[PDB]
Task: inverse folding
RNA sequence: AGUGGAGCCUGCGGCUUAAUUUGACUCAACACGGGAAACCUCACCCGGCCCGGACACGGACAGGAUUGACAGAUUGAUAGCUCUUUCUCGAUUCCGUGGGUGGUGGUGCAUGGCCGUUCUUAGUUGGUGGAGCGAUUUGUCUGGCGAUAACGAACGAGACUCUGGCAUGCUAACUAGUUACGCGACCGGUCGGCGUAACUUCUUAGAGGGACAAGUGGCGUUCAGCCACCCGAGAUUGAGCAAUAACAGGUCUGUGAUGCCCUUAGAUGUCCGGGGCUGCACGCGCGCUACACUGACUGGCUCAGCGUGUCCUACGCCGGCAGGCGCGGGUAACCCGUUGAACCCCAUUCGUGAUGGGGAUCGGGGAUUGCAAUUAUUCCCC
């Protein structure tokens, strides 16, 4: 059982990178060969609205920006350890996508 | 009218088949990233969704 | 008190294992209850004889405490440019000469 | 409007007490009323007639009517469908 | 088959918005504070933050069951995937979104605007806040629309700090003559460990430790230990 | 460097029109109302259809209250819209009375919210001390060191948050590569051509460092500062948020935010059909392309970044061209995409003239988009 991929993704790194170390730490305690957490580039969602509801003023614009930080962490193990590591370190606002082989 | 003529016209494209998902209005709609909100309604819920004004 | 730069007494603190000891976490809650002082009075009709009660504890129509409190409560319904403050939280007994000057 | 639709409304209201909408005269068939062919317009007007009569509680939220069962409105559908009182809705089943 | 993460995190934020709007619409006369969605693939657990948990539950838990059926039916996710839990807010005073609704309840209750506003102001000043403002504007006295303001404590108006210190809450009270807007901005404290405010210090406020007054040397002493 | 001068695109008025809806009129309206409107949008004009009158009362109603409908007349309409023709339907109603809804209907000079402006200003408020009975004053400071009954705060300004610049140090990388060694190809080399071992320099993104008037020397009531030089990546970029007090600034036309008024069934509610928003004598603007030799025409050589993507596309074939087909990838640093953009560079031709510059104005065919391109939607070529 090889090339199991875990995709941690959230909106800000202060909770993403917190649980990123909480998942790579369990594997080292369980003595598993794991790749480092690679940083798939932070995608920036950009929405520029008009500030007025009217069409009136100095034509001043908003700049709304949503950032999504993507991380990939690789482990090479049977898929039964994956659920017992990921299921305990549950954090709000951080979603854990997972593929097996 | 009867069912053949009451909605006889196809509302499948254009701004008449697109309304804000909150205020049902057909002007100033954003459909990038599948928001489907009004430009005045999105500014109310921008923080609640989690858009932050950085620059 | 409010200075931006501050001086810290972190050195002189001896021991503090229990920072959250249950002494200062008293849940102050009086707003939605009936312990709120800022509530309507549900007014009583004025007695025709001009006073309330018998014996020696007769609180009359012209009582200085009640009239002063009513003067402050009447002061609360002034124009918005008029600055009142929080005369209900502390007990005010505002007299008729003072209130009449203000009302004027 | 046909009585078949009006009866077809009143079943799903008794079991859970929740009926939803979208406010579209133009859209022809309501998802929750599967294989019964009741337009959402009839749902709107049948529960609006019950709103003025005090049997449902409205709460409009983002183009979606939310409908409820009043305490007195419990007995109203027990006379229409003649449901005997030993059958309880989902209001008082758990806990 | 799934939609892109760009269109997913957007559509998740629209989900957490409509639920909050609906809960505000229903429970504006309950003491409602907020939503806390915790997404678990077994069941999504939504915590209601309200100050009277008994009335939102209702008698025998009847209200929570009907509204969890509502949130089941509206969003289309399958049954047995929602778990609603009402919970008491830790401090009613510091949560200005809940507190800008209780003032609206008082203005609906027939109170004079100044009496209720000062009551709210003093309760949030006493609750542990470092400063606050309450602004009521509209038809206050006659047809001309004036304004009021109740300022006490300290406040900041510019910079990143504002984002995690004040809690701007704008509500509309619906009176017989018109509408009044209410703007409550409660400056939270620097409560570090505490869940009353954000640990992060204000970007400018600096604290200097007093010197541990060491022993002045008297005689060179060699002590073996 | 421009605009104003030319042609033209789009907003304004004036003018016609059944309508050429409307808001907005110095900066603080005029490519603004996310307003690039064929139907929708859409409110405006003409015509037609429906009730979607909730609810309560009175009357009618089962021996029917009604609904829907073939055929013909009419109709733009396989509009029972009305009549004839009489077929359906089982209280789901109908007529008046009250009274609720529905409005992109009227007041933004009745409101909220949001925004703009004064103002991106440089101010605003408190507390303590002293003078005065008091209004008030000092602070909130005369001077060109020195006086100095004053001292301290808070908001704003800065700080902050995001971004740009530096790290051959750290963290790691088959969804980015690099190095090496083999395989192959063509003349020790070039390969974006092929695979495993080295690594993070490049590419990514996290932490932490880095710059603080830094240093030195001249000029300055030698004061705040100025000039030169050095160390340096930098002696610093660009934003965001923005006080106190105000405008009778803009927005019922963003909302199921909204007080009253109006309309409420030959409807200001829907829906549908055709128009209009774009007309055209004329003035006002934002703007594109130009008036050419630093130019144009025709080849080759060419190097990005921000981003989008179920609609982005790769690839073969048919057609110059737009486009069709046939298959694949991509829900995404994996595929378009090594994003092989344009100005640019190198060769040819034109030579100061309304010229090949510059393309407006018009006639044709041809192809997609979509019920529908006539008031040319757009695109190709004469
Ligand atoms: Zn929007």
Result:
């Amino acid at each position: 059982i090889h090339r199991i991929r875990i995709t941690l993704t959230s909106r800000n790194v202060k909770s993403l990178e917190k649980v990123c170390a909480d998942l790579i730490r369990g594997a080292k305690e369980k003595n598993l060969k794991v790749k480092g957490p690679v940083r798939m580039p932070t995608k920036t969602l950009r929405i520029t609205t008009r500030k007025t509801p009217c069409g009136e003023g100095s034509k001043t614009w908003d700049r709304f920006q949503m950032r999504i930080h993507k991380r990939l962490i690789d482990l090479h193990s049977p898929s039964e350890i994956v659920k017992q590591i990921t299921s305990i370190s549950i954090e709000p606002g951080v979603e854990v996508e997972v593929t097996i082989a | 009218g009867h069912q053949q003529l009451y909605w006889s016209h196809p509302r499948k494209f254009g701004q008449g088949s697109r309304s804000c998902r909150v205020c049902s209005n057909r002007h100033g709609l954003i459909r990038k990233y599948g928001l489907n909100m009004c430009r005045q309604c999105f500014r109310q819920y921008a923080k609640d969704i989690g858009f932050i004004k950085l620059d | 008190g409010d200075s931006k730069v501050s001086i810290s007494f972190e050195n002189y603190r001896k021991v503090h294992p229990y920072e959250d000891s249950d002494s200062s976490e008293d849940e102050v809650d009086w707003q939605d209850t009936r312990d709120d002082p800022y509530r309507p009075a549900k007014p009583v009709p004025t007695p025709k004889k001009g006073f309330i009660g018998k014996g020696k504890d007769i609180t009359t129509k012209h009582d200085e405490v009640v009239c002063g409190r009513k003067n402050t409560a009447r002061m609360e319904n002034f124009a918005p440019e008029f600055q009142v403050g929080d005369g209900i939280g502390m007990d005010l007994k505002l007299s008729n000469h003072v209130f009449n000057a203000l009302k004027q | 409007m046909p009585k078949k639709n009006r009866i077809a409304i009143y079943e799903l209201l008794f079991k859970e007490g929740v009926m939803v909408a979208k406010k579209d005269v133009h859209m022809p068939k309501h998802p929750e009323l599967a294989d019964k062919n009741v337009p959402n317009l009839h749902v709107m007007k049948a529960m609006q007639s019950l709103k003025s009569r005090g049997y449902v509680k409205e709460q409009f939220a983002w183009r979606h009517f939310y409908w409820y069962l009043t305490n007195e409105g419990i007995q109203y559908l027990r006379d229409y469908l003649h449901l005997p009182p030993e059958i309880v809705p989902a209001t008082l089943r758990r806990s | 088959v799934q939609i892109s993460k760009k269109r997913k995190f957007v559509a998740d934020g629209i989900f957490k918005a409509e639920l909050n709007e609906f809960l505000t619409r229903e429970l504006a006369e309950d003491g409602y504070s907020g939503v806390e969605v915790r997404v678990t693939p077994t069941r999504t657990e939504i915590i209601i933050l309200a100050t009277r948990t008994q009335n939102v539950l209702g008698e025998k838990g009847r209200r929570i069951r009907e509204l969890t059926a509502v949130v089941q039916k509206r969003f289309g996710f399958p049954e047995g995937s929602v778990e609603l839990y009402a919970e008491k807010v830790a401090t009613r005073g510091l949560c200005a979104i809940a507190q800008a609704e209780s003032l609206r309840y008082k203005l609906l209750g027939g109170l004079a605007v100044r009496r209720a506003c000062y009551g709210v102001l003093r309760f949030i000043m006493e609750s542990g806040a470092k400063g606050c403002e309450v602004v009521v504007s509209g038809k206050l006295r006659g047809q001309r629309a004036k304004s009021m303001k109740f300022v006490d404590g300290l406040m900041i108006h510019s910079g990143d700090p504002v984002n995690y210190y004040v809690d701007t809450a704008v509500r509309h009270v619906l009176l017989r003559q018109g509408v009044l807007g209410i703007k409550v901005k409660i400056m939270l404290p620097w409560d570090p460990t505490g869940k009353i405010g954000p640990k992060k210090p204000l970007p400018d406020h600096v604290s200097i430790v007093e010197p541990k007054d060491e022993i002045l040397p008297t005689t060179p002493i060699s002590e073996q230990k």
User: Anything to note?
Assistant: Residues 19 and 89 of chain A are 7 Å apart (CA to CA). The two ends of chain A are 7 Å apart (CA to CA).
